[PDB]
Amino acid sequence: QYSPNTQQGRTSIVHLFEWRWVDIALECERYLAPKGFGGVQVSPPNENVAIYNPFRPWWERYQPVSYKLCTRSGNEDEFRNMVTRCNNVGVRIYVDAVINHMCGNAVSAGTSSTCGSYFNPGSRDFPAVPYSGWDFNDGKCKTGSGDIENYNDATQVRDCRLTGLLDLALEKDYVRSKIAEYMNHLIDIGVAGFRLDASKHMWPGDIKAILDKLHNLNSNWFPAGSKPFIYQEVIDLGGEPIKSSDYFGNGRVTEFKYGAKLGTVIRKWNGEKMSYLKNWGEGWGFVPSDRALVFVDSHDNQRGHGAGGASILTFWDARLYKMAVGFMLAHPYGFTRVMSSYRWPRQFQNGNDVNDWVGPPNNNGVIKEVTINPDTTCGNDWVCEHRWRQIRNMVIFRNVVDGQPFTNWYDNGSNQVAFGRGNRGFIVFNNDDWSFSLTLQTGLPAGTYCDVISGDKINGNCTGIKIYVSDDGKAHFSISNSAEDPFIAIHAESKL
Ligand SMILES: *[C@@H]1O[C@H](CO)[C@@H](O)[C@H](O)[C@H]1NC(C)=O
Numbered sequence: 001q002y003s004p005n006t007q008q009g010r011t012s013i014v015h016l017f018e019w020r021w022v023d024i025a026l027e028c029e030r031y032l033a034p035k036g037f038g039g040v041q042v043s044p045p046n047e048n049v050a051i052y053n054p055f056r057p058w059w060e061r062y063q064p065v066s067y068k069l070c071t072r073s074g075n076e077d078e079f080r081n082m083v084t085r086c087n088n089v090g091v092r093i094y095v096d097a098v099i100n101h102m103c104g105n106a107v108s109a110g111t112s113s114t115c116g117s118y119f120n121p122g123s124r125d126f127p128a129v130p131y132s133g134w135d136f137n138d139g140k141c142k143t144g145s146g147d148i149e150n151y152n153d154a155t156q157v158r159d160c161r162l163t164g165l166l167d168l169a170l171e172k173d174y175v176r177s178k179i180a181e182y183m184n185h186l187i188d189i190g191v192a193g194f195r196l197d198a199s200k201h202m203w204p205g206d207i208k209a210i211l212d213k214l215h216n217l218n219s220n221w222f223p224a225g226s227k228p229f230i231y232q233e234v235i236d237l238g239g240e241p242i243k244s245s246d247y248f249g250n251g252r253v254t255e256f257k258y259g260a261k262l263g264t265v266i267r268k269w270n271g272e273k274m275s276y277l278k279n280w281g282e283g284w285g286f287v288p289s290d291r292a293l294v295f296v297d298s299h300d301n302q303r304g305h306g307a308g309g310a311s312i313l314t315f316w317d318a319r320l321y322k323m324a325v326g327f328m329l330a331h332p333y334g335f336t337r338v339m340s341s342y343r344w345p346r347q348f349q350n351g352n353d354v355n356d357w358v359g360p361p362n363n364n365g366v367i368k369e370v371t372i373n374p375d376t377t378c379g380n381d382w383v384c385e386h387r388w389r390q391i392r393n394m395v396i397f398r399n400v401v402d403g404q405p406f407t408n409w410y411d412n413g414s415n416q417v418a419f420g421r422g423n424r425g426f427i428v429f430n431n432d433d434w435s436f437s438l439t440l441q442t443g444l445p446a447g448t449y450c451d452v453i454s455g456d457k458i459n460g461n462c463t464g465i466k467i468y469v470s471d472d473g474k475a476h477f478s479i480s481n482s483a484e485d486p487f488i489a490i491h492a493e494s495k496l
Pocket residue numbers: 459460461
């Protein structure tokens with residue numbers, strides 16, 4: 001459950017947040033496969049509550065009504081079509097599995113669901129699954145409100161409602177079986193793994209019981225004995241009775257401290273500087289690298305809805321964001337997830353963004369298709385960070401240096417640092433308020449290399465900066481604190 005199952009040489013997955021199945025299918029063939037992306041995190045593919053107040057928020061998808069593959073992203077056939085086409089081109093699909101709960105207990109009964117299924121939160125009835133009052137933790141939760149009230153009580157965090165969301169009795173074999181039924185349907189269709197939503201709110205043992213019911217991956221695309229990739233969403237920062245290590249026996253876990261600290265370091269909050277990243281990784285109190293799923297920002301915390309708070313870097317902070325993603329993709333720690341978002345009318349009031357609920361680009365609730373502009377960027381308000389030259393090229397950079405050791409580190413005691421990945425890659429950063437001009441040992445073989453941040457190698461020539469490595473592996477780098485992108489990266493495949 002720890003192996004991504006991506007095909008040899010692809011090292012990252014991209015979260016195509018709220019994309020329609022048809023658009024993801026096209027993206028797999030036209031861009032993801034050609035550019036070497038390993039896989040795609042898709043939004044919950046199961047039927048959710050259609051919320052109109054506010055108008056169709058992104059979070060309505062974390063409010064299950066049934067396990068029918070029927071959402072604003074498309075129907076079951078479109079989903080299967082997407083998984084098949086992506087797999088045929090070597091790009092894996094990872095499903096966002098919302099299995100801890102169903103919808104909010106206050107939601108009105110009726111058929112206000114993405115597929116018309118009837119449901120009645122009040123009486124705990126979800127006939128489309130089916131689930132009844134006997135399948136929820138109402139009688140097990142010991143808080144006065146029935147919701148989670150105190151995170152210092154590990155029991156309540158697991159048995160009570162996360163902000164009103166009906167909590168499934170995951171210790172019952174019936175519920176475990178209905179959930180495994182849903183997940184096995186997806187595995188047999190061809191998905192390679194799952195993001196387990198709200199894992200902190202489930203007992204490690206209950207999750208394990210469900211995983212034991214899972215099939216091996218589809219033998220038409222994967223070698224016999226392949227187990228699905230499992231990454232558990234657990235927000236674990238400082239002191240809490242619950243630790244992300246409690247979930248290691250089930251698969252990897254999301255390391256939220258990663259994006260949080262990279263953000264404060266690059267923003268240089270409270271005296272932090274890049275020279276400190278020298279021992280980045282477990283040295284910073286993070287989980288072991290082989291159990292980590294890392295990222296700079298997620299759909300949750302990019303809008304202030306998750307761990308990290310204000311330090312998190314997103315596409316809104318373009319310049320610093322690219323540099324953070326660059327460091328992540330170059331550093332050997334963890335398995336990397338790249339974010340791909342949509343723009344929304346951010347509107348801060350008293351420090352909080354009042355429009356953090358806004359769902360994906362749409363026309364009367366119908367999600368807009370992703371349009372590709374002539375320069376490869378996206379239209380219809382999709383940001384497509386994964387298509388930014390700077391990000392796409394660092395994705396490739398990680399593929400080229402895969403397996404290579406962390407070496408040749410340099411820092412000026414402040415914010416200009418550099419390091420290499422064996423003899424396959426080298427990257428330099430300048431986050432100080434003054435220029436950087438120095439000769440560094442790169443460990444790379446002599447030659448002329450194209451800087452993949454400022455340009456591309458395009459048939460015997462570079463469209464951007466060029467670096468010359470001498471016989472002893474030394475090379476000169478110049479980055480003024482005024483450069484559009486204050487960092488340079490060169491690798492074995494950008495060599496002329
Ligand atoms: C590189 O570009 C120059 C013009 O700037 C051209 O003379 C040269 O032939 C090009 N080399 C290749 C290999 O395309």
